[PDB]
Specification:
heterohexamer, A mainly beta, B mainly beta, C mainly beta, D mainly beta, E alpha+beta, F mainly beta, B: mainly beta, SH3 type barrels, D: mainly beta, 5 strands
């Protein structure tokens, strides 16, 4: 419990790095975006967000979205 | 304190949806969200991808075991 | 989550413990061991293997009193257990040599269920 | 979660409960707590696509429940006056 | 008030007008019935429920039901 | 920094698309949202597998089913 998970998040917010979110209920689609805001539930507001569909190597542009935190399995930088 | 004994240890994590990653546990909070460093995604293909330092949410972890 | 590791007796929050308890997952008896029903986890350590299993209560979808063939605890995990070298739901049983412990394990498990 | 108080009045009622994973439980309610953890006795449980398992008692986590099929003669109006 | 003007007003109006709602549940099941009572988590006591699914349409009748709110996906104010 | 709560209020009265965890999408005007993030949509269109499956009118979407919400345009 040295590194705090929210510290990564504040870091992403601060840095505007592009992140990718693996989702809880489905494995064939991930979300990517830049974090501009969040809350204590890890609900995230993402700018320039996209669905990434691995099987077809395709993407869908979403613009600005609020992603519900209970869908987040894993958050990584890309 | 349960996860404390796993700090700085290489772990294998089974995640919901048949997903599997391995990495070093660097941190956690009261909700068992984890920070895993040097994270490697083990693709169903058998390929391993380096995904870096990640946050994993506690509810998505099905199974956790140390590789050390 | 479920942790696979050596399971020592907890220093805090232990409600009930008993020895000579067989853990069965699906059709397979994993071995005989000691169960620890504690505030945060249901856990079991095999006498004959190095690592046991520790399970957060939120993952025990339900639990009850059954017999397989002898009076025993039944519980269900909400996923499939892949315990390497060892074993969308998994049916589990705790099978004590002494059936007098079953009613007590059941109450202790229900008390922990209510805490989470 | 105020409606849970309704279920808490169901002691001794025989019900069928469908779980979110498709398991059906048939049994007699011995109690329900404020989290909707549901305790039953004299239980027949049918996992999706499996034969029924028989249990002396069962306790179900509230969040695994989809719905209760209630007895046809249960007086809803009465049970619902708080 | 929150029941009157918030998203739950969908249920409020069903109970007051004694009209049926159509509820999409998990696993492609739908429930058509009347809401006798509900709470802020969308737990419900329902009556005269038609449960509908496909495998080819299938249905069955449940006279009295308690539905746990977190099983609900969507509730339609008008069935059909 | 634009947080989830202010963002949602800013969508109120506006056309939105709510994608569910289960893959279906709902397009409509966001009439209201509550502290749980339950949502009430009007003029609701349901999309299943990328195709319109029906015009639903007024719907309540329970909070725990949402994957994301975004404004149209």
């Amino acid at each position: 419990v040295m590194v705090q998970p929210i510290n990564l998040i504040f870091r992403y917010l601060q840095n505007r790095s592009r992140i990718q979110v693996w989702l809880y209920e489905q494995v064939n689609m991930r979300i990517e975006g830049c974090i501009i805001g969040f809350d204590e539930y890890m609900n995230l507001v993402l700018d320039d967000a996209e669905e990434i569909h691995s099987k077809t190597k395709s993407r869908k542009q979403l613009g600005r979205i609020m992603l519900k935190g209970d869908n987040i399995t894993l958050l990584q930088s890309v | 304190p349960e996860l404390k004994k796993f700090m700085d240890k290489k772990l294998s994590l089974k995640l919901n949806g048949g997903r599997h990653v391995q990495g070093i546990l660097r941190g956690f909070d009261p909700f068992m969200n984890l920070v895993i460093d040097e994270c490697v995604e083990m693709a169903t293909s058998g390929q391993q991808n380096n995904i870096g330092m990640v946050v994993i949410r506690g509810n998505s972890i099905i199974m956790l075991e140390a590789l050390e | 989550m479920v942790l696979i590791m050596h399971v020592s007796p907890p220093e805090h929050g232990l409600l009930y413990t008993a020895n000579n308890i067989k853990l069965k997952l699906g059709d397979k008896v994993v071995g005989e061991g000691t169960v620890y029903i504690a505030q945060n986890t249901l856990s079991w350590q095999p006498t004959e293997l190095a690592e046991g299993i520790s399970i957060e209560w939120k993952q025990v979808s339900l639990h009850g009193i059954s017999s397989n063939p002898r009076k025993c605890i039944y519980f269900m995990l909400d996923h499939k257990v892949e315990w390497n070298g060892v074993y969308e739901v998994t049916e589990c049983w705790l099978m004590p040599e002494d059936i007098a412990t079953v009613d007590t394990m059941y109450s202790a498990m229900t008390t922990c269920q209510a805490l989470h | 979660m105020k409606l849970v108080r309704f279920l808490m009045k169901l002691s001794h009622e025989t019900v069928t409960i469908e779980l979110k994973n498709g398991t059906q439980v048939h049994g007699t309610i011995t109690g329900v707590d404020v989290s909707m953890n549901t305790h039953l006795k004299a239980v027949k449980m049918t996992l999706k696509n499996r034969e029924p398992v028989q249990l002396e008692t069962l306790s179900i986590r509230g969040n695994n429940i989809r719905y209760f099929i209630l007895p046809d003669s249960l007086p809803l109006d009465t049970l619902l006056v708080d | 008030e929150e029941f009157n003007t918030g998203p739950l007003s969908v249920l409020t109006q069903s109970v007051k007008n004694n009209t049926q709602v159509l509820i999409n549940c998990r696993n492609n099941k739908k429930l058509l019935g009347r809401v006798k009572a509900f709470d802020r988590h969308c737990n419900m006591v329902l009556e005269n429920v038609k449960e509908m699914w496909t495998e080819v349409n299938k249905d069955r009748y449940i006279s009295k039901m308690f539905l746990r709110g977190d099983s609900v996906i969507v509730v339609l104010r008008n069935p059909l | 920094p634009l947080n989830p709560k202010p963002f949602l209020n800013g969508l109120t009265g506006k056309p939105v698309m709510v994608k569910l965890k289960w893959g279906m999408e709902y397009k409509g005007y966001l009439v209201s949202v509550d502290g749980y993030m339950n949502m009430q949509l009007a003029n609701t269109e349901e999309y299943i597998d990328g195709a319109l499956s029906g015009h639903l009118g007024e719907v309540l979407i329970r909070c725990n089913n949402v994957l994301y919400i975004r404004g149209v345009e």
